[PDB]
């Protein structure tokens, strides 16, 4: 996937605190992650895609090949099994841990990168625009 490539700034966000709470993120991390306005800087080299998320709270990064499950350490220190695929132009990320699942989709919409987060019955939408 490549139409996702470049540098994106979070401009809006709904229900993220609720989403985090449902994922199991403790209050202090929720406070600082919720308040953060991370840049998401996505790039691609052959079959390896790299997504960086940068903010004063925390800098993270994942590198991966579509369809190949990998170990991820999240910003909220979960140790999850991750599996990112391309499906009808949406990058679908799945995290499994403790028999739990959450799914994160990134899609390109007009000039936005739209990220939809889902845990159990809680859904969250965040929007990022080019830097």
Ligand X SMILES: NC(=O)c1cccc(Cn2c3c(c4cccc(C(=O)O)c42)CCCCC3)c1
Could you tell me the smallest distance in angstroms from the CB atom of residue 82 to ligand X?
Answer: 12
Neighbour-count burial for 96-105, b at 16+ CB within 10 Å, e otherwise: ebeeeebebe
Is 108 annotated as ligand-binding? no
Per-residue mark of binding to ligand X, 16-35 (x: CB under 6 A):
----x--x-x-------x--
Is 126 annotated as ligand-binding? yes
Residue 94 Cα to chain centre, angstroms: 10
* Contact stretch for ligand X (CB under 6 A) within 1-9, 41-49, 70-78, 81-89: 70-78
Does residue 117 interact with ligand X by CB under 6 A? yes
Could you tell me the smallest distance in angstroms from the CB atom of residue 28 to ligand X?
Answer: 12
Task: List the alpha helices (DSSP H) in the chain.
Answer: 16-23, 27-35
Per-residue mark of binding to ligand X, 77-106 (x: CB under 6 A):
---------------------------x--
List Cα–Cα distances, 88 to 6, 16, 33, 85, 91, in angstroms: 20, 25, 30, 10, 9
Tokens 């985090």, located at residue:
20
CB atoms within 10 A of CB 121: 7
Could you tell me the smallest distance in angstroms from the CB atom of residue 55 to ligand X?
Answer: 3
Contact (CB, 8 A) for 10 and 57: no
Residue ranges binding ligand X (CB under 6 A): 20, 23, 25, 33, 36, 38, 40, 53, 55, 57-58, 60, 74-76, 104, 115, 117, 126
């Amino acid at each position: 996937c490549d139409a996702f490539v470049g540098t994106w700034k979070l401009v809006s966000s709904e229900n993220f605190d609720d989403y985090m709470k449902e994922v199991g993120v403790g209050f202090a991390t929720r406070k600082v992650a919720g308040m953060a306005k991370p840049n998401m800087i996505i790039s691609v080299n052959g079959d390896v895609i790299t997504i960086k998320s940068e903010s004063t709270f925390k800098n993270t990064e994942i590198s991966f090949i579509l369809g190949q499950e990998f170990d991820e350490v999240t910003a909220d220190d979960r140790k999850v099994k991750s599996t990112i695929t391309l499906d009808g132009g949406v990058l679908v990320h799945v995290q499994k841990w403790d028999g739990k699942s959450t799914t994160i989709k990134r899609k390109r919409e007009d000039d936005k990168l739209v990220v939809e987060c889902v845990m159990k019955g809680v859904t969250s939408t965040r929007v990022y625009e080019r830097a």
